[PDB]
Symmetry: C3
Subunit: 436 residues, 3 copies
Amino acid sequence: RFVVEKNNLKVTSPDSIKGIYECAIGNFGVPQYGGTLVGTVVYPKSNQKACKSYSDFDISFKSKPGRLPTFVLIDRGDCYFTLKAWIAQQAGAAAILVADSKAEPLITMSDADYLQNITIPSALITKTLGDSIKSALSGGDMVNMKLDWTESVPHPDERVEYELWTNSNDECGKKCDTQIEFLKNFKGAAQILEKGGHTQFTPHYITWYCPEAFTLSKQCKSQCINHGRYCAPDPEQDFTKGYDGKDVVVQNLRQACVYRVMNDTGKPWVWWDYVTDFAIRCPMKEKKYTKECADGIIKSLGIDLKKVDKCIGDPEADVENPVLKAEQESQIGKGSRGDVTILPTLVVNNRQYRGKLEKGAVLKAMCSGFQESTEPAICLTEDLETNECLENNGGCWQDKAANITACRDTFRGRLCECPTVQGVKFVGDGYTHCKA
Amino acid sequence: RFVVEKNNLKVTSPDSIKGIYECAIGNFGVPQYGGTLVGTVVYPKSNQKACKSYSDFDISFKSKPGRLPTFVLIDRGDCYFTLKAWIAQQAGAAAILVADSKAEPLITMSDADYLQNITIPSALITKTLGDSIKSALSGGDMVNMKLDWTESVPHPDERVEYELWTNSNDECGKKCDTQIEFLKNFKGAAQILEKGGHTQFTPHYITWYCPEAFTLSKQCKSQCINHGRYCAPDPEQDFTKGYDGKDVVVQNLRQACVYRVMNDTGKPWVWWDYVTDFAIRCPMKEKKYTKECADGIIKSLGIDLKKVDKCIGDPEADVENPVLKAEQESQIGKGSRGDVTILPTLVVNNRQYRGKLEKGAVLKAMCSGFQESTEPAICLTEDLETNECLENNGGCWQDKAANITACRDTFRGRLCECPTVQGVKFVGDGYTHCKA
Amino acid sequence: RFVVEKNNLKVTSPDSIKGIYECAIGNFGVPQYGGTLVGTVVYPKSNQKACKSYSDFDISFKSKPGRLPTFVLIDRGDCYFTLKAWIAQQAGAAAILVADSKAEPLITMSDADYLQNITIPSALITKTLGDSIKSALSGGDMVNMKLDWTESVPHPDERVEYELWTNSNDECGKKCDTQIEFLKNFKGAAQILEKGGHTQFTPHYITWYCPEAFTLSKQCKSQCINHGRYCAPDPEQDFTKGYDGKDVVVQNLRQACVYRVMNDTGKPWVWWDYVTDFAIRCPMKEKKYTKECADGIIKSLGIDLKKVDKCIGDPEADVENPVLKAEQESQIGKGSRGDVTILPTLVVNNRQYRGKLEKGAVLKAMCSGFQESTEPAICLTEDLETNECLENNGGCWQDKAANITACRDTFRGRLCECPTVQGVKFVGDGYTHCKA
Ligand SMILES: *[C@@H]1O[C@H](CO)[C@@H](O[C@@H]2O[C@H](CO)[C@@H](O[C@@H]3O[C@H](CO)[C@@H](O)[C@H](O[C@H]4O[C@H](CO)[C@@H](O)[C@H](O)[C@@H]4O)[C@@H]3O)[C@H](O)[C@H]2NC(C)=O)[C@H](O)[C@H]1NC(C)=O
Ligand SMILES: *[C@@H]1O[C@H](CO)[C@@H](O[C@@H]2O[C@H](CO)[C@@H](O[C@@H]3O[C@H](CO)[C@@H](O)[C@H](O[C@H]4O[C@H](CO)[C@@H](O)[C@H](O)[C@@H]4O)[C@@H]3O)[C@H](O)[C@H]2NC(C)=O)[C@H](O)[C@H]1NC(C)=O
Ligand SMILES: *[C@@H]1O[C@H](CO)[C@@H](O[C@@H]2O[C@H](CO)[C@@H](O[C@@H]3O[C@H](CO)[C@@H](O)[C@H](O[C@H]4O[C@H](CO)[C@@H](O)[C@H](O)[C@@H]4O)[C@@H]3O)[C@H](O)[C@H]2NC(C)=O)[C@H](O)[C@H]1NC(C)=O
Ligand SMILES: *[C@@H]1O[C@H](CO)[C@@H](O)[C@H](O)[C@H]1NC(C)=O
Ligand SMILES: *[C@@H]1O[C@H](CO)[C@@H](O)[C@H](O)[C@H]1NC(C)=O
Ligand SMILES: *[C@@H]1O[C@H](CO)[C@@H](O)[C@H](O)[C@H]1NC(C)=O
Ligand SMILES: *[C@@H]1O[C@H](CO)[C@@H](O)[C@H](O)[C@H]1NC(C)=O
Ligand SMILES: *[C@@H]1O[C@H](CO)[C@@H](O)[C@H](O)[C@H]1NC(C)=O
Ligand SMILES: *[C@@H]1O[C@H](CO)[C@@H](O)[C@H](O)[C@H]1NC(C)=O
């Protein structure tokens, strides 16, 4: 239960042992915010194991004004680490320093008890560093130290998982427009949530297969790919002028593949910047609902296109697409979640969501899974901007000769709107170009 | 308990019965957000009434990957509708389709029970449409359908009612200024609240009558109208230079009448745009506290002036004004509310309000009447703008030759401030004109 | 339990007793928001002491439409004031008027009981004014009055106290930058909190003393002042190029002294404007981390410099600094708070704070000490701007010949950024000058 950090521990005196040394800071007993604790150390005579209370041996630390905090050197073993910190904190100790009797610097080894009151930092030091202090304290030399935990303490091992089911269609009416306005408004929140490790978002899509009585029929050719293995209704429903379901299944699988690629590289928030820019740059009315326009966004955001077209695979082949198969399989009820039948469905913590699609409504439902003192900044009724403008200018237009870019980070996420220079509203096509 | 919607139901196959048909979607079991559910239908052999559990007859629906959802055709009668949906949802059904044995398409007919877990959509179809499916399922033809509830589910039948008591005076000190800053700041919130059906606001005003010992005295002539039937103190209290109480009673009755007219047409939020623009365009210091200036706002906002001057009636006649009589009557304690004596008094859900006049304080008090999963967007710590700019340009100045208007929708509501074009701050009188 | 206010009470009739008179409005029974209550008075025959229920003597006040509210004249004594208001409110009275039988106008004299339902205003009037009404009611003359409590009811006697421990160093890494971004972001919230009397903030700083074995050593000369009585580690830790701990102890003591001076004059929020402008105008990289640059901020904000340099005293003398002694003493555990060892430590209501340093996180922790219906505007999820721009232009640059200033009040507090005029972004050194 100790995370190893090298630059955290530093010794100021004695000068013979001065320097930076590695230590394994504890997960509990330290504050979330980063900081610094400077103090001296004391090695007790009795109860060096800290397995019993220090009041029995009449050992107190008695912090006084102007005095350096009293770090305690504890011999590892005979009792749990959390109990050692509790005994020292009762005596008034500022922090504990456990020296493992084992020589391995990497070894780092419970039940929910009354340990939340522990507020003193804990650390595990190498046996070499521990015995170096024991010798300095026996010679009459003070050992003054500095401890910089510094880490904001992410603790994102168990967070909130939300899965959204959407469609890339934009002409089906107000239902499709409500989702786009939601994705554009929720992008800024979801990005900072995933960047802070507070959320794990997985976008999902819905496809069906051609029935056996309709196999090779004309309706199965217009709405389905991979020989009728993955389907979707026609957007316009006119068919003669509509884009047909195939183009929808392709762009859905493309957006799913953009997530499959970015999730492996460690940037799933890029999926949000892709689907929002997809609705802005590649519409169906302008006939820009093509693969060429979609690949332009993939290139503008630095997304790897080879990994995407490989994830997509053959659009027309009797083989099965692994992502669309995993998506149709993801629709089946996996325990308490139940089956996913509705098209705009959101599932938070493996239980579905029926409230309104408002951003604040979705947020208020997600902040219920978080515990107190761990709620993110966004959850605590605080509004913040994104930070995508700093890399590749967010994939927005830019003129370095004038220190002027089309990128702008907002609460809705990065937006590549043409900038206004000297009062002149530049009119251009967002990132592709901008001109007065 | 079913709302009738025509375009919601559509049949894709068989082609002999394809088309859009009317259906009565259920109030419960459907999500608030709008969406689409595409699936096929199944007519059970036993328990067609859905009055008993399907596990007794060993009937399950067994949803599988890639399979269309399983709509169920239930014969109406012998049990309640909510119990039919509960039995099907246990078997894994996606939605139920009740076919009324009665031939009337309009007939649509409990106690609070464990029905909140019902999350499958419910619908009532005509007996013609129901028997058309029974014949298609007996011939061996699949019936694939699409159901678009789509409605955001307003459910505004029982909402929050708040009544505010104000005065149009603007020179009585800081007390009158605190109300105007409140009305200007709360306008944007109250408008979106009433537009979404979440609130019913009624503005109220306070008037007294001349005592019998003071009848026809000079003080009763300055402060009272309708031969001393409705009164108000002098604003300035100097009388010689003050506007006298009569002008206050007239403008109060005028603002009340603006609400009486707009409430009948279905736009009570216009009262907010009127009283805020009244404090901006018709002040007492500029001597614009006249009927002419007030009628200009009535014309700018498209308010019907005939219905207002009829509601006002004769300002000086021994007859009684019905609105001011209903207002003086509205002051009397009608149950738990008690009498309304304080001038800036707010009553929410027929119980008064003592907290501070801050917008967030008034909001937090109103969001207590709303239930969870039904709180409006404004209540859920989300800040949004209004939408009055789209009609008549909100009654603000506009130059179509430059695509430039003086209207601006904000969180405080529509505001007719002069726009800034090309860096040049146009200086003008708001809506009346604007010029660089 | 009555606050004396002169202009609150005014009499309209009879004309022989008309005028403004002093009265002692009650702390309870009145609303927080300011307003006005106009009504007539009634002196009961029996139970003039209001010590028994009015239903026994069959005395009711019976408010009717158009009728003036019924103020009650109660003789002081024989029972508590709160019980008198409760008896009158049951009879339907609008407000009570207690006339002290004692002739002193200043005398104004419990356990938590069921008195929260009391919503009628209460007031204590002089015996002269009380007997003047008794004579007017015996002669058959109506006494019409007006009562303007008006006060927002601050009640800031017992509020939230938060103490923050910071350091003026800006090159120690990200730990020092996290604090500055926090102080810049929290400045706007903390200022409005202290201005409304809702918070008492005391900034604190951490210093140590030179050990006896290190007295007069070179390391004690670089990090410590007053002959090694107050210390701090070197910022850069290089010493050869670092500013040395002495400069840090001096600027910390200077910032503490700026608070010690401003707290006595009644403007502790100026400390926030000082430390934020200190990080903007006097950095260490530009070598502006000098006393001269720091005194410029003291002069720009109108802070009294004599009281600051006196609080600082002799930077190098064997005497002890009273503020730094009170600061080192403030570090010791004073009850439930415990010792303060961590450098960025915040203590709210004498109990420490472990959550993240986010503004919303700190706010949510502070709003827990406030009771309901008394939470400030900032606490109730409402965002507001400051009001420092109105005095000395917030100590920002200004050009009166163009109505253009560099001051701007925001949610982060006053900021002296160069203004943009006619689209031209003026580039200057904030307040010191600004030019296109
Ligand atoms: C996006 O990429 C992330 C990369 O982190 C990925 O998250 C990872 O998912 C895997 C698979 O779900 C998680 O591994 C699971 O972790 C726990 C803890 O051990 C176990 O419950 C799981 O065991 C399963 O797999 C075992 C295989 O040995 C089986 O024996 C067992 O029966 C279970 O089936 C499983 O190991 C992993 O913890 C996360 N990691 C993080 C950091 O979240 C995510 O799934 C990717 N998403 C998509 C949509 O591709
Ligand atoms: C602004 O206009 C709206 C228009 O909707 C208006 O709201 C309506 O007010 C009326 C009158 O208060 C409401 O009707 C009431 O509804 C319930 C349900 O039936 C009943 O409690 C009431 O019965 C009363 O009236 C009966 C007359 O037959 C009496 O027999 C009975 O004893 C009661 O006195 C009454 O019918 C109506 O429901 C609302 N409608 C909506 C949609 O809110 C509002 O009052 C107008 N406001 C102003 C200030 O003019
Ligand atoms: C900033 O200036 C403000 C000015 O208001 C100042 O707040 C005041 O602090 C003093 C000292 O802490 C408070 O006085 C205390 O009040 C209560 C109520 O009576 C008592 O608990 C305290 O008694 C102490 O002092 C007595 C001296 O006679 C002793 O007999 C007793 O044992 C206690 O030690 C004490 O009187 C005062 O109430 C506040 N006032 C306000 C309005 O807050 C604040 O301390 C200054 N801060 C700094 C950092 O300089
Ligand atoms: C310990 O933390 C718990 C949290 O449940 C709290 O109730 C308790 O008062 C704390 N006790 C001490 C001594 O800090
Ligand atoms: C361009 O703008 C960036 C972003 O602030 C800034 O760091 C950089 O110095 C600027 N370059 C110029 C003004 O030449
Ligand atoms: C049904 O809803 C209630 C709401 O009170 C909830 O407590 C319960 O867990 C739900 N049960 C199921 C099976 O969904
Ligand atoms: C005027 O502005 C409106 C509002 O955006 C826009 O719809 C319209 O096309 C504009 N007309 C022009 C630029 O001629
Ligand atoms: C009095 O106030 C209390 C607050 O605890 C409330 O519960 C109660 O209903 C109120 N009673 C009346 C009669 O207003
Ligand atoms: C300067 O600006 C102030 C702040 O609004 C204003 O009160 C004043 O009238 C202005 N003076 C001018 C425009 O001469």
